[PDB]
Design a protein around this ligand. Structure first.
Ligand SMILES: Nc1ncnc2c1ncn2[C@@H]1O[C@H](COP(=O)(O)OP(=O)(O)O)[C@@H](O)[C@H]1O
Ligand SMILES: Nc1ncnc2c1ncn2[C@@H]1O[C@H](COP(=O)(O)OP(=O)(O)O)[C@@H](O)[C@H]1O
Ligand SMILES: Nc1ncnc2c1ncn2[C@@H]1O[C@H](COP(=O)(O)OP(=O)(O)O)[C@@H](O)[C@H]1O
Ligand code: BEF
Ligand code: BEF
Ligand code: BEF
Ligand code: BEF
Ligand code: BEF
Ligand SMILES: [Mg+2]
Ligand SMILES: [Mg+2]
Ligand SMILES: [Mg+2]
Lengths: 537, 48, 76, 519, 509
């Protein structure tokens, strides 16, 4: 064993052809997939990934495990970039889009060893998908709480899941409250709002859901108030900085007469000081600049008990302002003047307070005019668990933004897989030929999710996998009696149940893209028959 | 996988030969004839 | 910086039990226990031990595995 | 701070079992091409520097070194196959591996290995009986005594470098399994000899016995180099003046005694020497030397000789001219000697070869092999041992099965059909082994180019739907009755094969922790 | 490289268990001092758990998670540091068997532990009694409780005093919860020497900065304080301020202007008739002069933290630009301005004969850090009660109560779900045990009796430290903030739940 030599065709690098490379690819994808096949399902578990300094992170987000795990090799990166696509597209389904991909190559490859051209296998998988995508719309349905359910089942393989009921609720709640219309209709749920925060202390359950937003800052000078308004407040969402001006980059102050020295000088302080006044003089009780504040132009807010926060997160102010109806003041101008325009640009908020959280202490803008908004704040044992709590609070809360934007769900629990399996499997004879083996493989291959969903329970999973297999195989006999697919796995107990009833819901939009995608990879790799690796520099 | 580390996949001959790292001189010649197959027809770079 | 006391013998390693040693040992034993715990019974499995002179060996028996291994922990 | 093994690797887990399987697969896929009539061949240049080229799967798997415990069993079962049988060595491994391959799905899905082990266990039992059940015993059932040994040494000599010169060698092969007593077939008698040069078929079948030319002494060139019915004296020891070895001390105080003891030495030899002459022999051979003076003597009186004959040679010499080794020259009686039909000293391939050809009373032949390279002669000798050894085990068991995938394909049938009646775990496992047998027909087609998929699948119909000997028409690529086409192999192969192959397969599926010690 | 399977699990458990093992002999009234050596140089002779584990770098991931537990806990309550570590370990350890021995999946053991936590927390609030956060005597004998087990006990009473006398001082209810920022308003100040008792809680601040000019007031009776950001020297232009002169007698002109602006500045300050001007930045020699005859003493360079605490015990709100210097920015409500010279090192005081400055004295710069930390624990449990007037049965009593009410319930639950639940109960028991051990008495003996007496006869029955016999808490009392018993069990069960989620460990960024 071991490929080698060259003889003719002098090439500045490595080059494997046929069997040799074609297997290498399959091995590659295989390994990168197998690392995260033990994180699949509720019975699946997280892992710790230590660096060189010794620090680490524990996480089940397949996409971050494959990101965090240094992968060197095309077909390896491919499935790490494909695991990426998911987390970037829908937001959950990563761990699974890879396990599928790997399974398609691994399998398809076997067909080639049997002497079956790659293309004939490719078209075969292509048709198995056409039929499979269509059929996927024959298990799904319109939203008919489906929400607190979607948000829950998406926390099974996660840390946040021991307290499913709690967060499953806080998730939908928080998201919903932020909805908007983008432009011309839409009604999209902010694919990123709800500033999430975390602080070590108290229970996992004691995670608060602010009734507004959580801007993470103090209050400039400790001299100003730490809590303002009980009834109504005017919030100044700025952007321009209130510090001592410096004039044009090319504006030399050339003095010819010692007179002008002192004058123009102290003028500098006032120029950006007037700007301060024209803002306090608007009813501004709360100021949120983005580009920081002077300590001089701060005392002005202090002397006036105006909660004024320095250099804020501009990604928050943009949302702190849509939430108090205010205006992100780029620079007081309008036509040709200068003012933050009394309450014209200001925002209406119920109350601005600086709540503490042991060690930390941040500001809260809870209750507002047009806010609707929310923001969650995790509390855990330490950063190690906390990063992950959120990590999967997101991989969960994302499943919701898509169930919403796309009113359509399918029963997970490895049901979808089983169904497609037996359907495509029987459908496989509708073309016979060599091509049969293709679809057949495709279908058969899908049973990876149900098998591995269960094997992650140690017990002889050949049980469920067999039962669930049979069921659908039967159900599609008058698919008539009382047709009952939607039968998934209940690993916690070890039996086949109706997941739609049980509460195991997953958005169609996931398993529809998770599938169309994973094959798009498998094919571009199925075509690989020679890998020329140039020598670097 | 180029010298730079960028990965590529294709059936277009002129592009495989181009990025292949052919070393022999008269061998490099082939890449140029496939180059010109692209410059006139735009197709058949593999066949030429 | 840290000093060091009461030493006049040669370069040994004394594991006083008043240092939770009994358990350090339970550990070492605990490790080789799992090897035998799956070799017993008809449902037992074999292990391929490869000699320190390089010879293959496969056996369900326990006294043989242990024999062919390079054990070192005194409590083991 | 303490330890328990001193830095000495050892893996365990479920992956451990999977590693081992795949490991074996490698060593397996390695030989897959050397299978079938149109089978590929290998060229191994071991770290030794000796370059070899062959197909005896055993010989290949012996040159691969291989150290992986698991994968190393495939090397063992391949060796045994070249023992208890002599042929099929290539295949015992293809299967042995293939099973381990089909065990992966279960082991992965999360099934006990003890269950897969049981499943395969029955599968073999059933499959083994089925072969015994088809082992067409014959004798004159339109087969004849020679046409069985020929028809079987032929098909088995196929797919070897010795192929297109088949007829020549099968007629040669059978003739040499018969050369020895059919009551006790001992290979050690068919002693082969290799001669540098010549056509890979300009090889010669000596009827009596042929051997080197150890004749390393002066005074030769005299002594006829050819006799018709000579009186062979298969002597065992010495024939030198001062003796080749052993001594004592001679102490004398008299000048005359000196010259006396001398004249004695001489006469001491000459006597023993004439003692041989007295036997009235024409050919005097000895596993020990025949000094200058000695060989010189016989040379004078037209008696031929040779000293220091190969030990394993004199024994074939006896069995040829029917002599009988003699250690001393004294009690040499005449039923001790031997005589052939013809003796000559050839110049085959630029090398003189003493050979006692023609011996209707022999129980041991010898055969010289030719070739344009020390690799081809070498491959012939191994391509021929695989045949001779199959002819031999076809006398002792006139039971034969039609291979070419048929036997293999059929044993699948009954095994797959049986699994229907079982249902469940044992169903899949026993039904797996059934499919796993398809590797021989499968591979056999890919190696040659035939449509592996269609030819296989088309075979499954007809074979299961009747024709219990349908295999593969090496000729018009298509299925066919290999028994009718005369593709015969003793059942003794397949039966040993599936027994011994599975052994490996469960030996591996039984190991959960591999502890390699370093040192 | 990689370690999947029980392999992983085990090393995690053992790791976590070992973390405990180190400081277990630091939990108890007879707790020993772990003198640790820091890399930077000096040493740490403390026995305060978190302060130890901080000074020990660890490797195994779990040992890292286990170590940070002591931190998040030292952030909620100031106390109960060592306890959380020991519990957090024993929980994982007590699961070890049912985790692999009884082959219970990590999901199930987690589902139970999260459940057993809540029930367990009930039993804590169930045995907790409330307390008069205002009753000076109760607060003292409360603060005193968490001062034992520390070098600072030989002055226990003296400590709770400086504790309360400071918690309450920086406190400021506010309602429209109670806000006590011990951190920014109770700047400590460790001064080598004297006696312990020779330390007081000055109601003001203490800076060692002297006076800007010799002939300047060493102490103004009732000073008028003026705190400011900006420096006291000729400023410059934040643009390309470049002067070109060829007009001879113009050099003198500009060079003079500088003196002139320093004058103006002194005016604006002098205006509100001040006696004490403390600036965070510098003080031009000129400005000193005009503030000298202007009638006031000056203090240059003082930290923001130092300054903003002054502005709470002088009322003098700090102001930047002087041409805006209001008169509301007074210096009212501020006693003297002493400038005691403490052993060749001048100081300055600002007591009034909202923020105090605890000034400790002991017997070394080294010994003081013992006190400071010890004190922090006192001053923190005081704050806890201030924001949660509930207390728990000390002497490990509470810990045993939860052991039974849980043990009982577990035994009466039935299902594999019972074993993990049972362990939480068995686990809890370790604290009264570590106590009894570090006491010297027989663990198997005292516990069986403590546990039994608990099972029926009251739940406020823990173990007595220096004694080693089981005593009733109410009796000699040693309740601790109920808040501590919250966290200790909240995060400990969490920690366990996290690490149990691990079945694989890998190395590389
Ligand atoms: N409650 C459940 N019972 C059975 N299966 C579930 C349940 N919760 C999620 N699943 C299934 O587990 C898989 C998702 O788990 P996970 O490992 O998190 O994949 P991903 O990380 O890709 O979301 C899907 O098959 C989903 O249908
Ligand atoms: N003439 C043939 N036609 C079809 N199959 C044959 C023929 N000759 C041998 N075979 C088959 O080829 C396989 C033997 O392969 P070979 O290369 O001879 O290695 P070995 O005999 O050592 O296994 C067996 O299946 C045998 O039945
Ligand atoms: N006076 C004492 N007698 C018996 N137990 C005590 C006494 N003082 C502290 N305890 C108990 O020991 C623990 C406090 O010990 P300590 O060494 O202070 O650890 P921590 O750093 O967690 O405070 C608590 O369980 C408390 O109930
Ligand atoms: F880990 Be998965 F993406 F929910
Ligand atoms: F490959 Be060719 F250029 F289409
Ligand atoms: F049967 Be035991 F392993 F000796
Ligand atoms: F290669 Be086998 F022995 F015919
Ligand atoms: F001992 Be603890 F930190 F008060
Ligand atoms: Mg998920
Ligand atoms: Mg053969
Ligand atoms: Mg304490």
């Amino acid at each position: 064993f071991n490929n080698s030599r060259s003889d003719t065709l002098f090439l500045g690098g490595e080059k494997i052809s046929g069997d040799d490379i074609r297997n290498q690819n399959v091995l590659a994808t295989m390994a990168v997939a197998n690392v995260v096949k033990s994180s699949l399902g509720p019975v699946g578990l997280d892992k710790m990934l230590v660096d060189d300094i010794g620090d680490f992170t524990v996480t089940n987000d397949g996409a971050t495990i494959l990101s965090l795990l240094d992968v060197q090799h095309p077909a390896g990166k491919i499935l790490v970039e494909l695991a990426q696509q998911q987390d970037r597209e829908i937001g959950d389904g990563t761990t699974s889009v890879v396990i599928i991909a790997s399974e398609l190559l691994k399998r398809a490859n076997e067909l080639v060893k049997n002497k079956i051209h790659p293309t004939t296998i490719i078209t075969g998988f292509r048709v198995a998908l056409r039929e499979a995508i269509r059929f996927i719309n024959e298990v799904l349905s319109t939203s008919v709480e489906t929400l607190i359910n979607i948000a829950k089942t998406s926390m099974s393989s996660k840390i946040i899941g021991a307290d499913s009921d709690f967060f499953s609720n806080m998730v939908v709640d928080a998201l919903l409250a932020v909805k908007t219309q983008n432009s011309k209709g839409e009604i999209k749920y902010p694919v990123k709002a709800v500033n999430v925060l975390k602080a070590h202390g108290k229970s996992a359950t004691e995670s608060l859901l602010v009734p507004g937003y959580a801007l993470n800052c103090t209050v400039a000078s400790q001299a100003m108030p730490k809590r303002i308004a009980g009834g109504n407040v005017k919030i100044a969402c700025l952007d321009l900085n209130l510090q001592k001006a410096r004039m044009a980059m090319g504006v030399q102050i050339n003095i010819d007469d010692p007179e002008q020295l002192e004058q123009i000088r102290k003028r500098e302080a006032g120029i950006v000081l007037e700007r301060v006044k024209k803002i306090i003089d608007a009813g501004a009780q709360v100021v949120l600049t983005t580009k920081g504040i002077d300590d001089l132009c701060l005392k002005e807010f202090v002397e006036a008990k105006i909660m004024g926060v320095r250099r804020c997160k501009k990604e928050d102010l943009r949302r702190i302002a849509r939430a108090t109806g205010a205006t992100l003041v780029s620079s007081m101008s309008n036509l040709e003047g200068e003012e933050t325009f009394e309450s014209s640009y200001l925002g209406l908020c119920d109350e601005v307070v600086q709540a503490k959280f042991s060690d930390d202490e941040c500001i809260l803008i809870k209750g507002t005019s047009k806010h609707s908004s929310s923001s969650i704040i995790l509390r855990g044992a330490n950063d190690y668990s906390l990063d992950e709590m959120e990590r999967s609070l997101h991989d969960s809360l994302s499943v919701v933004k898509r169930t919403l934007e796309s009113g359509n769900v399918v029963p997970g629990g490895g049901c979808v897989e089983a169904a497609l399996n037996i359907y495509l499997d029987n459908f496989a004879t509708t073309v016979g030929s060599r091509e049969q083996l293709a679809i057949a493989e495709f279908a058969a291959a899908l049973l990876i999710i149900p098998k591995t969903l269960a094997v992650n329970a140690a017990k002889d999973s050949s049980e469920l996998v067999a039962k669930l297999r049979s069921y659908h195989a039967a159900s599609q006999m008058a698919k008539k009696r009382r047709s009952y697919r939607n039968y998934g796995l209940d690993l916690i107990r070890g039996k086949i149940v109706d997941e739609i009833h049980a509460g195991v819901l997953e958005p169609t939009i996931s398993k529809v893209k998770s599938l169309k995608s994973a094959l798009e990879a498998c094919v571009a790799i199925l075509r690989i028959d020679t890998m020329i690796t140039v020598d670097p520099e | 996988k180029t010298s730079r580390g960028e990965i590529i996949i294709s059936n277009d001959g002129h592009t495989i030969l181009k990025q292949m790292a052919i070393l022999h001189p008269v061998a490099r010649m082939l890449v140029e004839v496939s180059a010109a197959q692209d410059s006139e027809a735009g197709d058949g770079t593999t066949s030429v | 910086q840290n000093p060091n006391a009461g030493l006049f013998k040669q370069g040994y390693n004394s594991y006083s039990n008043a240092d939770g040693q009994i358990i350090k040992s339970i550990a070492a034993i605990r490790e080789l226990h799992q090897m035998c715990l799956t070799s017993m019974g008809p449902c037992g499995r074999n292990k391929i031990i490869v000699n320190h002179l390089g010879k293959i060996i496969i056996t369900n028996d326990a006294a043989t595995m242990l024999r062919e291994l390079d054990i070192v922990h005194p409590a083991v | 701070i303490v330890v328990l093994k001193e830095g000495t690797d050892a893996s365990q887990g479920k992956g451990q079992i999977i590693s081992n399987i795949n490991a074996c697969v490698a060593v397996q896929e390695a030989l897959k091409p050397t299978l079938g009539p149109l089978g590929s061949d290998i060229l191994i240049v071991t770290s030794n520097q000796k370059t070899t080229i062959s197909n005896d799967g055993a010989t290949i798997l012996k040159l691969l070194d291989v150290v992986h415990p698991a994968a190393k069993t495939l090397v063992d079962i391949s060796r045994a196959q070249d023992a208890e049988v002599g042929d099929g060595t290539t295949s015992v491994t293809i299967l042995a591996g293939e099973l381990m391959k089909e065990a992966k799905p279960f082991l992965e899905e999360g099934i006990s290995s003890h269950l897969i082990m049981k499943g395969y266990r029955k599968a073999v039992s059933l499959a083994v009986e089925k072969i015994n059940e088809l082992a067409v015993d014959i004798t004159s059932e339109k087969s004849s005594g020679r046409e069985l040994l020929e028809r079987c040494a032929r098909t088995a000599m196929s797919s070897k470098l010795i192929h297109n010169n088949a007829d020549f060698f099968v007629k040669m092969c059978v003739d040499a399994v018969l050369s020895l007593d059919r009551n006790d077939l001992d290979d050690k008698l068919i002693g082969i000899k290799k001669i540098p040069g010549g056509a890979m078929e300009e090889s010669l079948f000596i009827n009596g016995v042929a051997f080197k030319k150890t004749f390393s002494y002066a005074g030769f060139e005299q002594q006829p180099k050819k006799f018709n019915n000579p009186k062979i004296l298969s002597l065992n020891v010495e024939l030198e003046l001062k003796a080749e070895k052993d001594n004592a001390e001679v102490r004398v105080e008299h000048v005359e005694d000196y010259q006396a003891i001398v004249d004695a030495e001489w006469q001491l030899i000459f006597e023993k020497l004439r003692q041989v002459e007295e036997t009235g022999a024409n050919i005097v051979l000895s596993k020990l030397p025949i000094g200058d003076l000695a060989t010189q003597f016989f040379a004078d009186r037209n008696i031929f000789c040779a000293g220091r004959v190969s030990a394993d040679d004199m024994n074939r010499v006896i069995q040829a001219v029917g002599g009988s080794i003699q250690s001393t020259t004294s009690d040499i009686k005449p039923e001790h000697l031997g005589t052939c039909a013809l003796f000559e000293e050839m110049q085959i391939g630029s090398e003189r070869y003493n050979l006692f050809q023609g011996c209707p009373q022999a129980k041991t032949c010898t055969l010289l092999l030719r070739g344009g390279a020390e690799q081809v002669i070498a491959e012939v000798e191994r391509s021929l041992h695989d045949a001779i050894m199959i002819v031999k085990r076809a006398l002792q068991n006139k039971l034969i099965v039609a291979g070419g995938g048929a036997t293999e394909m059929e044993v699948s049938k009954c095994l797959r059909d049986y699994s229907k009646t079982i249902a469940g775990k044992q169903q899949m496992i026993i039904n797996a082994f059934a499919k796993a047998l398809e590797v021989i027909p499968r591979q056999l087609c890919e190696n040659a180019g035939f449509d592996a998929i269609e030819i296989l699948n088309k075979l499954r119909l007809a074979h299961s739907k009747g024709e219990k000997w349908y295999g593969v028409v090496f000729e018009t690529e298509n299925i066919g009755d290999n028994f009718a086409k005369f593709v015969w192999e003793p059942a003794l192969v397949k039966i040993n094969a599936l027994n011994s192959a599975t052994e490996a397969t469960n030996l591996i599926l039984s190991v959960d922790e591999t502890i390699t010690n370093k040192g | 490289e990689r370690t999947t399977g029980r392999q992983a699990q085990i090393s995690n458990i053992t790791a976590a268990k070992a973390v405990a093992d180190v400081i277990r002999t630091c939990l108890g009234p007879k707790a020993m001092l772990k003198m640790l050596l820091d890399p930077m140089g000096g040493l740490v002779l403390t026995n305060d758990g978190h302060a130890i584990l901080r000074e020990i770098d660890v490797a195994h991931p779990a040992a890292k998670s286990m170590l940070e537990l002591s931190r998040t806990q030292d952030e909620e309550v100031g106390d109960g540091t060592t306890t959380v570590i020991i519990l957090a370990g024993e929980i994982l350890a007590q699961c070890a068997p049912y985790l692999i021995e009884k082959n219970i999946h990590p999901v199930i053991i987690i589902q139970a532990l999260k459940k057993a936590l809540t029930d367990a927390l009930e039993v804590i609030k169930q045995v907790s009694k409330p307390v008069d956060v205002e009753n000076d005597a109760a607060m003292k004998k409360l603060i005193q409780a968490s001062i034992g087990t520390k070098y600072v006990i030989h002055w226990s009473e003296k400590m709770c005093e400086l504790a309360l006398d400071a918690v309450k001082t920086v406190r400021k209810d506010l309602g429209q919860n109670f806000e006590i920022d011990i951190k920014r308003y109770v700047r400590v100040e460790k001064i080598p020497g004297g006696d312990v008792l020779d330390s007081r809680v000055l109601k003001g601040v203490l800076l060692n900065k002297d006076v800007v000019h010799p002939k300047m007031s060493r102490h103004i009776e009732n000073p008028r304080v003026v705190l400011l950001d900006c420096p006291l020297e000729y400023k410059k232009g934040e643009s390309q301020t470049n002067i070109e002169i060829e007009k001879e007698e113009d050099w003198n002109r500009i060079l003079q202007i500088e003196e002139e602006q320093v004058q103006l500045m002194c005016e604006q300050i002098l205006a509100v008739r001040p006696t004490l001007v403390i600036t965070e930045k510098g003080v031009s020699d000129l400005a000193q002069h005009y503030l000298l005859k202007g009638g006031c003493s000056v203090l240059r360079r003082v930290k923001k933290s130092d300054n903003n605490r002054i502005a709470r015990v002088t009322g003098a709100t700090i102001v930047n630009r002087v041409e805006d210097l209001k008169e509301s920015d007074v210096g009212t409500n501020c006693g003297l301005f002493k400038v005691e010279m403490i052993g060749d090192e001048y100081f300055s005081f600002l007591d009034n004969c909202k923020a105090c400055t605890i000034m400790l004295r002991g017997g070394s710069k080294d010994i003081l850090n013992e006190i400071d930390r010890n004190l922090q624990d006192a001053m923190a449990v005081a704050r806890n009660v201030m924001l949660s007037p509930s207390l728990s049965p000390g002497g490990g009593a509470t810990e045993m109560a939860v052991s039974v009410k849980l043990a009982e319930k577990a035994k009466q639950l039935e299902g594999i779900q019972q074993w993990p639940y049972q362990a939480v109960a068995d686990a809890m028991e370790c604290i009264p045990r570590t106590l009894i051990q570090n006491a010297g008495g027989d663990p198997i003996r005292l516990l069986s009796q403590l546990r039994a007496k608990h099972a029926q006869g009251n739940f406020t029955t823990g173990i007595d430290g220096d004694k080693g016999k089981i005593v009733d808490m109410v009796s000699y009392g040693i309740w601790e903030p109920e808040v501590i018993k919250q966290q200790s069990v909240k995060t400990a069960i969490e920690s366990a739940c996290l690490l149990l989620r691990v079945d694989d460990i890998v190395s590389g960024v």
